[PDB]
Amino acid sequence: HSHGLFKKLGIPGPTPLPFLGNILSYHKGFCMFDMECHKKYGKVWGFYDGQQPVLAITDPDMIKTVLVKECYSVFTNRRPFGPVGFMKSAISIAEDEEWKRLRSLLSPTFTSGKLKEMVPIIAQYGDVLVRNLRREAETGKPVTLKDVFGAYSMDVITSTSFGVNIDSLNNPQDPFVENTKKLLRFDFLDPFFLSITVFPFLIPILEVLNICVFPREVTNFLRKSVKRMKESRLEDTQKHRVDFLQLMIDSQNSKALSDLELVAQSIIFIFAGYETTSSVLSFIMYELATHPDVQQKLQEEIDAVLPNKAPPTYDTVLQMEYLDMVVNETLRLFPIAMRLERVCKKDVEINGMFIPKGVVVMIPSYALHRDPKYWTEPEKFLPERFSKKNKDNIDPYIYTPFGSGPRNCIGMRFALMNMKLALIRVLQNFSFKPCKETQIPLKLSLGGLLQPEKPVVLKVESR
């Protein structure tokens, strides 16, 4: 029984139960579990996900070692998370040289030049969003911001990546949004995902049964969508710009990117660009609404840089320090990650401490983001933390909302800009106010993914 390993290495931790490990402790959300474990254990601890030994680490240097120094040699892959099917070839799930080949190929997608060619493309979509909101602005009833941001983010990602205008904004009952949000119902009171975290030995078996954590009732829709919208649809080059679709087409003809492998990456992009982007935007608006001085101070920058509702540009976006601070701050309090993780591929002693092969190393981002060692009054939302005159007191290995090292978020620059353009255009025309149903203080979901327990509703007013 691999359960005696952490006591056998002198590493502290909560007592494992047979078979379950410590999974019962996720009863109050694992973020809480992490915070407790930090308070009580220190720099370093160990616990079990079923039989799977995880090792939490909090030392900055040790974190840098793992994420950056030894990524290529030792800590190269994340943990396998369940029965995955064809999606084994998605970049974020892919391991070692198959991942590195995919990384190398998709790296060029998000260069400042490729990015600045999206500035005008999104610009046209920000106009549609503005208009959508003005419609509810005129009505004056609570908005579920994920709905409006969702379709926005979907329209943005679909056009930037493939060239296709699916027009999600002008479509409430939209198949592309409706299918994509059903993709991961991750939940521990959901008897399925619990059981593969506990019992991952059933994984090999479910693969052979073509069972995915992804409803095939989704992946088939997305498979058919991308199927010939790559093929007979994009043909005569025609208006062909910077689209990752082509970058995967262009590097198929004259190494070698398969067809199902192509669909697989697209799904990663569609999901990231929809769910992640829209969740964060919803989190910032909640903060800006529960903090009006912050919302105003921002609206002032927005007009100070773009004189009286002027159209945003690449260079214009980067200039705005306070807008970057507001985004960074929300991401401090609401990390979509909530844990960074790497599988130990061979044996190592990192900075005077030994990790055996097969162990999962886990950085508890959520916890470290709220640690009194690094953060003054870490509970409070304080954008001023990220000002030019305070960001040196910030440790680059305690604050990583995008991960770090060679496996960090490939989408960082895209999402930052995409989110900011959305914000600018929105605050440039509207102000946001608390509602009667607005969950204050907002509690997070007890289960898996970082989401509100109650969906975010707020009042919208034009200026």
Binding residue positions for heme:
409
Which residues would be at the binding site for ligand HEM (CB under 6 A)?
91-92, 103, 268-269, 272-273, 276-277, 280, 336-337, 340, 401-404, 407-411, 414-415
Angle (CA) 283-287-288 rounded to 5° is 115
Closer Cβ to ligand HEM, 166 or 415, answer by number: 415
Q: Which one of 4, 10, 140, 191 is in contact with a copy of itself (CB under 8 A)?
A: 191
Q: Which one of 7, 17, 43, 462 is in contact with a copy of itself (CB under 8 A)?
A: 17
User: Per the structure block, which two tokens stand in for 403?
Assistant: 């991960």
User: What is the distance between the alpha carbons of residues 382 and 390, in angstroms, rounded to a whole number?
Assistant: 12
Among 16-24, 72-80, 231-239, 334-342, the segment contacting a copy of itself (CB under 8 A): 16-24
Closer Cβ to ligand RIT, 148 or 267, answer by number: 267
Q: Which of 445, 411, 379 is nearest to 185 (CA)?
A: 445
Closer Cβ to ligand HEM, 58 or 404, answer by number: 404
> What does 49 bind: a copy of itself, ligand HEM, ligand RIT, none (CB cut-off 5 to 8 Å by kind)?
ligand RIT
Binding residues: 409
CB 180 within 8 A of CB 164: no
Q: Does 183 bind ligand RIT (CB under 6 A)?
A: yes
Provide the minimum distance between the beta carbon of 430 and a copy of itself in the complex, in angstroms, as a whole number. Answer: 46
> What does 197 bind: a copy of itself, ligand RIT, ligand HEM, none (CB cut-off 5 to 8 Å by kind)?
ligand RIT
Q: Does 352 bind a copy of itself (CB under 8 A)?
A: no
User: What is the distance between the alpha carbons of residues 338 and 448, in angstroms, rounded to a whole number?
Assistant: 10
Which residues ranging from 20 to 79 are in contact with a copy of itself (CB under 8 A)?
20, 24
Cα 327–chain centre separation:
14
Residues 6 or more apart from 1 whose CB is under 8 A from it?
18, 51
Which residues ranging from 323 to 342 are in contact with ligand RIT (CB under 6 A)?
336-339, 341
Q: Which of 450, 290, 445 is nearest to 365 (CA)?
A: 450
Q: Does 18 bind a copy of itself (CB under 8 A)?
A: yes
Closer Cβ to ligand RIT, 88 or 240, answer by number: 88
User: What is the distance between the alpha carbons of residues 2 and 174, in angstroms, rounded to a whole number?
Assistant: 48
CB 129 within 8 A of CB 169: yes
Among 15-23, 88-96, 361-369, 418-426, the segment contacting a copy of itself (CB under 8 A): 15-23
Q: Does 208 bind a copy of itself (CB under 8 A)?
A: no
Q: Does 363 bind ligand RIT (CB under 6 A)?
A: no
Q: Does 413 bind ligand RIT (CB under 6 A)?
A: no
Q: Does 5 bind a copy of itself (CB under 8 A)?
A: no
Which position's Cβ is nearest ligand HEM?
A: 403
Provide the minimum distance between the beta carbon of 304 and ligand RIT in the complex, in angstroms, as a whole number. Answer: 32
Residue 229 corresponds to which amino acid? Answer: M
A 10 A CB-CB count for 165 gives: 13
Among 19-27, 149-157, 230-238, 375-383, the segment contacting a copy of itself (CB under 8 A): 19-27
User: What is the distance between the alpha carbons of residues 322 and 319, in angstroms, rounded to a whole number?
Assistant: 9
Q: Is 340 helix (H, G, I), strand (E, B) or coil?
A: strand
Residues 6 or more apart from 296 whose CB is under 8 A from it?
none
Q: Does 409 bind ligand RIT (CB under 6 A)?
A: yes
Determine how β-strand 360-363 pairs with β-strand 52-57.
Answer: parallel
Provide the minimum distance between the beta carbon of 271 and ligand RIT in the complex, in angstroms, as a whole number. Answer: 4
In which residue are the tokens 């009505």 written? 139
CB 149 within 8 A of CB 136: no
Q: Does 81 bind ligand RIT (CB under 6 A)?
A: yes
Q: Does 1 bind a copy of itself (CB under 8 A)?
A: yes
Provide the minimum distance between the beta carbon of 310 and ligand RIT in the complex, in angstroms, as a whole number. Answer: 31
Residues 6 or more apart from 107 whose CB is under 8 A from it?
410
Q: Does 71 bind ligand RIT (CB under 6 A)?
A: no
Q: Is 458 helix (H, G, I), strand (E, B) or coil?
A: strand
Q: If you count DSSP H runs as helices and E runs as strands, how many of each does the chain have, helices first?
A: 18, 10
CB 319 within 8 A of CB 305: yes
Residues 6 or more apart from 205 whose CB is under 8 A from it?
none
The distance in angstroms from the start CA to the end CA of the chain is 65
Provide the minimum distance between the beta carbon of 25 and a copy of itself in the complex, in angstroms, as a whole number. Answer: 12
Determine how β-strand 143-144 pairs with β-strand 52-57.
Answer: unpaired
Q: Which one of 57, 84, 198, 226 is in contact with a copy of itself (CB under 8 A)?
A: 198
> What does 18 bind: ligand HEM, ligand RIT, a copy of itself, none (CB cut-off 5 to 8 Å by kind)?
a copy of itself
Preceding residues of all breaks in the chain (C to N beyond 2.5 angstroms)? 254
Closer Cβ to a copy of itself, 208 or 256, answer by number: 208
Provide the minimum distance between the beta carbon of 49 and ligand RIT in the complex, in angstroms, as a whole number. Answer: 5
Q: Give the burial class of 130: count Cβ atoms within 10 A of its Cβ; 0-12 exposed, 13-18 middle, 19 or more buried.
A: middle
Q: Give residues in contact with ligand RIT (CB under 6 A).
A: 49, 78, 81, 92-93, 183-184, 186, 197, 267-268, 271-272, 276, 336-339, 341, 409, 411, 448
Q: Give residues in contact with a copy of itself (CB under 8 A).
A: 1, 17-20, 24, 191, 198
